[PDB]
């Protein structure tokens, strides 16, 4: 995004919810044998976004044709994994 000034302020609770894509619930990150992110933990692919480059976690979709579908095996959105750092 192009810009030409910067502003800072306190974030009201509804603004903070607005930045959210999900609400974290479990005190966990990734499994300790396999290494999938444990869902609703601090890495859950459906809160933040998919781990694999442009393909989903539940395995159901693996091609740009499905770009932006949300599955119903685990609930992840298939999208750019780049956005996993954005949300």
């Amino acid at each position: 995004e192009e810009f030409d000034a910067i502003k800072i302020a306190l974030a009201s609770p509804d603004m903070i919810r607005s930045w959210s894509f999900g609400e974290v619930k479990k005190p966990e990150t990734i499994n300790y044998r396999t290494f999938k992110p444990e869902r609703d933990g601090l890495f859950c692919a459906r809160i933040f976004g998919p781990v694999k480059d442009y393909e989903c976690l539940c395995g159901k979709y693996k091609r740009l044709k499905h770009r932006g579908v949300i599955c119903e095996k685990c609930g992840v959105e298939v999208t750019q994994t780049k956005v996993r750092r954005e949300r």
């Binding site: 869902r39 949300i70 119903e72 685990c74 609930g75």
Partner: protein, 205 residues
């Protein structure tokens, strides 16, 4: 009227996991899932087009436990209902009562859900339904009766349903052993891999 053979066999034949076992134990540990069934399994002869249509049909039918006559009847009902034939077919199949039971988790596998619905543990709006293929309509309060509400397997399946990711169009309270059907599932609310068009054109050959 039912498939009584090995289940992981079907899973291997399809290739995918069809969820025919509870998923306590990994399928790789129970079998060589990466291999077609039988002596001559290890081979992928370039599948014919109708062949892949057939394979998709078999995948869905053996995920849900529906014999082909009933499945063709479902196909015809979908052709009747207006809208998109594929989403309509998925709507009917999901609306199957044994499927709703498995969904609300009162059964480790859809086989167990059919078993309990057959042995009269399932009641829709206080009326005990004995046919597994009953068509649950929207906003139906489907409950479990007491006699099999003591069932240890029932409670363990409640826990394993809490393990699974929960469907969005079903409101099931485990303590009260009571689910409620609210809205017909969306295509996006079902698994995504299944392609409507394959089954559609297969039966509209």
């Amino acid at each position: 009227a039912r498939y009584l053979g090995p289940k992981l066999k079907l899973s291997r034949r399809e290739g995918t996991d069809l969820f025919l076992k509870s998923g306590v134990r990994a399928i790789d540990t129970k079998c060589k899932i990466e291999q077609a069934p039988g002596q001559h399994g290890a081979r992928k002869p370039r599948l014919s087009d109708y062949g892949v249509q057939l394979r998709e049909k078999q995948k869905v039918r053996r995920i849900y436990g529906v014999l082909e006559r009933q499945f063709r009847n479902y196909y015809k009902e979908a052709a009747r209902l207006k809208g998109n034939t594929g989403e309509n077919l998925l709507a009917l199949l999901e609306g199957r009562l044994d499927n709703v039971v498995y969904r609300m988790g009162f059964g480790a596998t859809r086989a167990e859900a059919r078993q309990l619905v057959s042995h009269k543990a399932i009641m829709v709006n206080g009326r005990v339904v004995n046919i597994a293929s009953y068509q649950v309509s929207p906003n139906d309060v489907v409950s479990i009766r007491e006699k099999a509400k003591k069932q240890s397997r029932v409670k363990a399946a409640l826990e394993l349903a809490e393990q699974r990711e929960k469907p969005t169009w079903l409101e099931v309270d485990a303590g009260k052993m009571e689910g409620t059907f609210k809205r017909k599932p969306e295509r996006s609310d079902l698994s995504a891999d299944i392609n409507e068009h394959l089954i559609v054109e297969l039966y509209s050959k």
